[PDB]
């Protein structure tokens, strides 16, 4: 069966994702402007993984 869509969870998660992507873009702009990128790579992969999970769930339902 289709499970009750946990509205609040996805709402908060999407808000966090939006702001996270925006601030990542801000760090990218700063780079264009220490400077170790390892945390930047961790951000990029974390966002990719989270977006992947959300997409999987959405497509499944």
């Amino acid at each position: 069966e289709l499970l009750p869509y946990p509205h609040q969870l996805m709402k908060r998660l999407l808000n966090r994702i939006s702001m996270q992507s925006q601030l990542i873009e801000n760090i990218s702009m700063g780079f264009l402007d220490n400077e170790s990128k390892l945390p930047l790579l961790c951000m990029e992969t974390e966002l990719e993984r989270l977006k992947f999970v959300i997409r999987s769930y959405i497509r499944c339902r």
Partner: protein, 92 residues
Amino acid sequence: NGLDTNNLSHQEQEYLKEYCDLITDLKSGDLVDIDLSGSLVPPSDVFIDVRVLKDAGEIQTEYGVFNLIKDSQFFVRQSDVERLIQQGYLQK
């Protein structure tokens, strides 16, 4: 399509067009941040080396440009070139 018309009945063709419209409607708006048409394979690899299967000339990127030159290899993040790979230009 999110990323043989003769075989399709005209009703089938219209329905498929409507379905494509519906999908683009979904990925547009709320939830746009995630690309529903995106691959359902998990992004295990942050970075992937790729060889251009078919030369198509330079292509643009958010912060760069990729010169697609037959038998030229690129080491770039998977996400950026996943669409090109799906388009068959890029190998591995």
